[PDB]
Amino acid sequence: MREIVHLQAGQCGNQIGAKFWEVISDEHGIDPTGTYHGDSDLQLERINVYYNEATGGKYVPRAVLVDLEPGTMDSVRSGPFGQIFRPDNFVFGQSGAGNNWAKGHYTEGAELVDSVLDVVRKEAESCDCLQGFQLTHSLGGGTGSGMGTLLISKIREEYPDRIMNTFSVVPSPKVSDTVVEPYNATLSVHQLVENTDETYCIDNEALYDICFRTLKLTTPTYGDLNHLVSATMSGVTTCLRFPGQLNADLRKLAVNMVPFPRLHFFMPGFAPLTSRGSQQYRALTVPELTQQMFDAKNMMAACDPRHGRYLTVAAVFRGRMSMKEVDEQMLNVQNKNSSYFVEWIPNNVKTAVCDIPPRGLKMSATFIGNSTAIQELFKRISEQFTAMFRRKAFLHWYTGEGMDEMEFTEAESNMNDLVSEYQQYQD
Amino acid sequence: RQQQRLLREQRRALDCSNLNLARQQYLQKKQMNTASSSQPTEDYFSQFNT
Numbered sequence: 001m002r003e004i005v006h007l008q009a010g011q012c013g014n015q016i017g018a019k020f021w022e023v024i025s026d027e028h029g030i031d032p033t034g035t036y037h038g039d040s041d042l043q044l045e046r047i048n049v050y051y052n053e054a055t056g057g058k059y060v061p062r063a064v065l066v067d068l069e070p071g072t073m074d075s076v077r078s079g080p081f082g083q084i085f086r087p088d089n090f091v092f093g094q095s096g097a098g099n100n101w102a103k104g105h106y107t108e109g110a111e112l113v114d115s116v117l118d119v120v121r122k123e124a125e126s127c128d129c130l131q132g133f134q135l136t137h138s139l140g141g142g143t144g145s146g147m148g149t150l151l152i153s154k155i156r157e158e159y160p161d162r163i164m165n166t167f168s169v170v171p172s173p174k175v176s177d178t179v180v181e182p183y184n185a186t187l188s189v190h191q192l193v194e195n196t197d198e199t200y201c202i203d204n205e206a207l208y209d210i211c212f213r214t215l216k217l218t219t220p221t222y223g224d225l226n227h228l229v230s231a232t233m234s235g236v237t238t239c240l241r242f243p244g245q246l247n248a249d250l251r252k253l254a255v256n257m258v259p260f261p262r263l264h265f266f267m268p269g270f271a272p273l274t275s276r277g278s279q280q281y282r283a284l285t286v287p288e289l290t291q292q293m294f295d296a297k298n299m300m301a302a303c304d305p306r307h308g309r310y311l312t313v314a315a316v317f318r319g320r321m322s323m324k325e326v327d328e329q330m331l332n333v334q335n336k337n338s339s340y341f342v343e344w345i346p347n348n349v350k351t352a353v354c355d356i357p358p359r360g361l362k363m364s365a366t367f368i369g370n371s372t373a374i375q376e377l378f379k380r381i382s383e384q385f386t387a388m389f390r391r392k393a394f395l396h397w398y399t400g401e402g403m404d405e406m407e408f409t410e411a412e413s414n415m416n417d418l419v420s421e422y423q424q425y426q427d
Numbered sequence: 428r429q430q431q432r433l434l435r436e437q438r439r440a441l442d443c444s445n446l447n448l449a450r451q452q453y454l455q456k457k458q459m460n461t462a463s464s465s466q467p468t469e470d471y472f473s474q475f476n477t
């Protein structure tokens with residue numbers, strides 16, 4: 001049987017996986033202590049895709065936690081579900097980050113890659129057959145990119161036959177806090193496109209805008225933001241864990257989503273987001289779901305695909321619906337904007353219907369998108385990289401670590417080579 | 428003439444059954460009707476407070 005092992009990297013990913021995991025435990029109805037309370041037969045059955053069974057009916061999460069700063073681990077261990085996570089799975093380092101990409105990629109990783117590889121292969125041999133792996137981290141995250149780029153390279157030759165899902169957050173376009181962050185992102189993405197097959201793009205500014213749009217609660221918590229993305233990541237994973245005539249496996253989806261090899265960056269899309277009075281002012285119907293499902297405001301990933309065109313679109317539907325409403329709704333959407341799709345590929349819509357609703361609503365869905373709206377992102381970072389690399393600011397650290405501008409040359413070039421590739425297909 | 432009587436007896440009897448039948452799927456389609464629309468609960472509002 002085919003299962004998944006998760007990887008939790010970077011200090012954001014440390015917050016990402018925590019909320020990501022507790023949702024699943026609450027979804028399957030396990031107590032914080034770990035004693036599962038048998039209530040749903042189906043979730044009792046297909047929990048082995050992610051969790052192993054340990055004694056006393058406790059379901060050990062099959063994730064590995066990695067970092068350098070103990071305070072983050074002490075916090076997450078002290079959380080409501082830190083007891084469910086294994087001290088076996090808490091691998092870390094004795095060093096502070098400096099949030100330097102090179103140190104986590106050349107210096108600190110070297111004496112930690114050995115330990116983490118043993119842990120995962122112990123977990124890999126603990127399981128029977130894998131679809132692959134998924135990673136929670138950030139591309140702009142100083143240390144998470146340090147482990148991520150290294151480990152994905154190592155796991156490539158280790159298991160080049162599995163699903164190497166990646167989940168990273170794009171930093172805020174308006175401000176990056178970290179000033180060497182554009183260096184770190186450019187460094188990471190070069191190996192990312194070289195290595196990964198799947199990548200989710202996430203940005204906080206839209207999340208703040210969504211909070212201003214539907215959450216209408218002034219001051220949220222970053223964990224609430226983590227809940228939103230975890231809800232999305234839950235939705236895409238509800239395919240595998242749940243029955244119903246939907247085709248769930250990722251490369252059943254992936255071959256449907258990617259036209260050409262270097263297309264790994266994909267954008268999410270989610271289903272009803274509702275405000276305080278609209279819960280009792282909304283007639284929850286697939287049309288208004290579909291309308292809301294395809295909203296530029298419902299977008300949250302990077303920026304509006306209104307500026308570009310739509311290469312491939314896939315909406316997975318979770319709940320008690322039928323073939324015809326999604327059949328007519330898709331027929332509705334193509335007739336609305338036929339030109340906004342590329343003439344290159346017609347019928348670029350791929351739909352899945354999960355019949356197992358979430359715990360509280362039935363009419364639900366999720367969207368994964370590949371449009372021509374990523375250009376602005378790295379085009380932005382292009383001026384960032386060129387301007388700072390114009391006068392090599394903050395560079396003596398990397399040379400002190402042992403890094404050269406030569407690595408930067410092909411890194412941006414490979415990035416720029418991707419830019420020409422996106423546009424020349426779509427234009 | 429007896430056969431003619433039997434034929435219409437069959438026709439009426441079948442007509443008795445289908446009218447009996449016709450009533451249930453009307454109930455059944457109503458069962459279908461109020462089984463799709465959804466409403467979110469407070470379980471979707473508490474977690475965002477944390």
Ligand SMILES: Nc1nc2c(ncn2[C@@H]2O[C@H](COP(=O)(O)OP(=O)(O)OP(=O)(O)O)[C@@H](O)[C@H]2O)c(=O)[nH]1
Pocket residue numbers: 009010011012013014015097098099100137138140141142143144145146177178222
């Ligand atoms: N945990 C957490 N991370 C955040 C938050 N907001 C933005 N981030 C960013 O998410 C990035 C990913 O974290 P990591 O990959 O663990 O970062 P790192 O490698 O230790 O390097 P740093 O940037 O110094 O943290 C960080 O660099 C932060 O800049 C937040 O609210 N919580």
